[PDB]
């Protein structure tokens, strides 16, 4: 590769160059050389933009260059175009888009966060990133970008209140485990980061969410079931979700499921089932159908709990919890 020199270019001309090269790539009816040329140019411009924002091993980023670039990026709609056309970009440029996007997104003038403001005017960016999970070539980079978006509450809210959020229940069970894992990470972050927002989402969408969530707890995928059961326990024990939790632990069919998951072949699964089961029983205001199930299996539960993972030896919380549940269930009187 013949080592030519690099000519310096303004942020404005770089944005312009990329805009024109992206337009070429979107077209089908161009020669292989014209497509190749545009491929090389997109790649080189993206490297140039990245270097303005992160600097190099020798130079740190300078604020004037950064501010010109962000401005130009917002005015051109290229933040939208690069996400929309992500599939058309080379392997390393796709990673460059993610890095550029993430850096702009963290940009903060005073208390304000201008990129968040911009994505609120341009919300399909979020939905294009989410849809990216369905395409193996762009999924990981979309995931990285989306996970940085949802750090900001307004952007988290847009996704949580959409129809498209429920697509996650498909994505987390995808047979390519690297992408399924990535998607479950974003899904868990959404439900756990902005706890007030998440509590409101769960109260307002209770029935649809837990209907979908119930399916995850029946998954033929071992990790889906293990992870989902764990997240469930962490969600119900959170003080922000008290209202949701009291609804959940009042339904007979949920107790049935937890009781069954206590008899799963997986030691891990039955332990994470315990974390949810314990809450149904600790509850002082148990409904009749709940109270009926505990009295029906009173002797069996006492016996089961006495011999339940006894080799789990220095978890003092688990031991005391088991003691408490046995007392509670023993103290159940039939009126």
């Amino acid at each position: 590769p013949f080592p030519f020199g690099k000519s310096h270019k303004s942020p404005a001309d770089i944005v312009k160059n990329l805009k024109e090269s992206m337009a070429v790539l979107e077209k089908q009816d161009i020669s292989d050389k014209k497509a190749e040329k545009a491929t090389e140019e997109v790649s080189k411009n993206l490297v140039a933009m990245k270097e303005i924002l992160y600097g190099t091993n020798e130079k740190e980023p300078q604020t004037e260059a950064v501010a010109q670039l962000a401005q130009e990026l917002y005015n051109s709609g290229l933040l939208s175009t690069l996400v929309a056309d992500l599939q058309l970009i080379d392997f390393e440029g796709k990673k460059d888009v993610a890095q550029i996007f993430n850096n702009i997104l963290r940009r903060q003038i005073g208390t304000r966060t201008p990129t968040v403001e911009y994505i609120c005017t341009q919300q399909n960016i979020l939905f294009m990133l989410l849809k990216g999970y369905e395409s193996p070539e762009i999924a990981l980079n979309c995931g990285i970008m989306l996970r940085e978006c949802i750090r900001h509450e307004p952007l988290a809210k847009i996704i949580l209140w959409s129809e498209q959020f429920y697509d996650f229940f498909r994505y987390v069970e995808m047979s390519t485990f690297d992408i399924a894992s990535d998607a479950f990470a974003t899904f868990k972050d959404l439900l756990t980061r902005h706890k007030l927002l998440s509590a409101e989402f769960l109260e307002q969408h209770y029935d649809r969410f837990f209907s979908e969530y119930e399916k995850l707890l029946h998954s033929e995928n071992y990790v889906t079931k293990r992870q989902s059961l764990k997240l469930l326990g962490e969600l119900l024990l959170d003080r922000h979700n008290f209202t949701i939790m009291t609804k959940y632990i009042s339904k007979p069919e949920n107790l049935k499921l937890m009781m069954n998951l206590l008899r799963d072949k997986s030691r891990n699964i039955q332990f994470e089932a315990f974390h949810v089961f314990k809450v149904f029983v600790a509850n002082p205001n148990k409904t009749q159908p709940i109270l009926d199930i505990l009295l029906k299996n009173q002797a069996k539960l006492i016996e089961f709990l006495s011999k339940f993972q006894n080799d789990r030896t220095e978890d003092e919380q688990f031991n005391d919890e088991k003691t408490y549940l046995v007392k509670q269930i023993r103290d159940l009187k039939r009126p």
């Binding site: 790539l25 485990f177 690297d178 990790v223 764990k230 299996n297 069996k300 011999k307």
Partner: protein, 304 residues
């Protein structure tokens, strides 16, 4: 708004391996790792008959932290694409087990080669070809803002046609915190008891100054000694091997450069590639240097 929605069809005339257990017929165990929890199998990819490697770990024997650590490897390996970094082809759950499929390297690892034949260490020309490939890989990994953290002979694989690949991506660690590169990092490599002898003093002395990419450069040197002698320095030595950590002449100067106490004094992988040591120099020179090794071509149920 683009005109490439015919992409599904645009290619698929070729890629990925099917992410399904049934597609693989397990043959021999070729290796073992992850604290004895991973079995490395040679396999036949049924749809092509082609040979591949299947890495299998029982997730039931893994803590939550161990599962997180493992999912990190899958993330990092899909970010990397380089001629000297081992490609990953598929990753899926075959239930209760994580299966990770990579291409099969028919000469195994540099450590395998040492054990099967070169027990007294490899010839010097071979070491130059091998360590050049490792260095190209490390250069790429370092430019990406990562540290490897487990460069050793068993993490260097050699294919049927003499290509060298760095493996061992499970231990890779990002120095990118809060969207920015950090000059030093402080994480003690989890589940790396055994990798200790290849570790630089500044990675080992936890709670002190911390480390960067030049720690990998020290591991290159230890690996050079491992490849020359057939044994790693400080083997069988107690944990406080710390204290002691505190052939052509070009080879010697190569090794002595990697092994400098001061990491700031150590050269980067890119400038190390310009070192005199590699002047003696790839996919037709190595198979021959590896001669005569031949590769093969209680309670009753609830009532409701």
């Amino acid at each position: 708004a683009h005109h490439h929605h015919h992409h599904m069809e645009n290619l698929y005339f070729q890629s990925s391996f099917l992410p399904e257990g049934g597609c693989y017929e397990l043959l021999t165990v070729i290796g073992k790792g992850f604290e004895d929890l991973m079995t490395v199998n040679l396999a036949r990819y049924k749809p092509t008959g082609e040979y591949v490697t299947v890495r299998r770990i029982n997730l039931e024997a893994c803590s939550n932290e161990m599962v997180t650590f493992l999912q990190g490897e899958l993330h990092v390996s899909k970010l990397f694409n380089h001629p000297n970094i081992v490609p990953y082809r598929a990753t899926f759950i075959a239930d209760n087990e994580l299966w990770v499929v990579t291409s099969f390297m028919a000469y195994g690892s540099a450590k395998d080669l040492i054990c099967t034949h070169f027990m007294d260490g490899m010839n010097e020309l071979a070491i130059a070809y091998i360590l050049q490939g490792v260095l190209k890989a490390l250069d790429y990994i370092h430019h990406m803002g990562y540290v490897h953290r487990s460069v050793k002979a068993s993490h260097i694989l050699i294919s049927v046609d003499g290509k060298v690949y760095l493996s061992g991506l499970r231990s890779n660690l990002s120095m990118i915190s809060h969207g920015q590169r950090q000059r030093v990092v402080h994480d003690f490599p989890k589940y790396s008891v055994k990798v200790l002898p290849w570790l630089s003093p500044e990675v080992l002395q936890q709670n002190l100054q911390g480390y960067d990419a030049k720690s990998d450069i020290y591991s290159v040197g230890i690996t050079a000694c491992e490849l020359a002698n057939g044994h790693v320095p400080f083997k069988d030595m107690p944990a406080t091997q710390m204290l002691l950590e505190k052939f052509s002449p070009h080879f010697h100067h190569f090794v002595e450069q990697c092994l400098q106490r001061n990491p700031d004094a150590r050269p980067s992988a890119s400038t190390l590639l310009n070192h005199s040591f590699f002047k003696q120099i790839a996919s037709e020179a190595l198979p021959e240097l590896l001669r005569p090794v031949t590769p093969i071509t209680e309670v009753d149920d609830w009532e409701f």
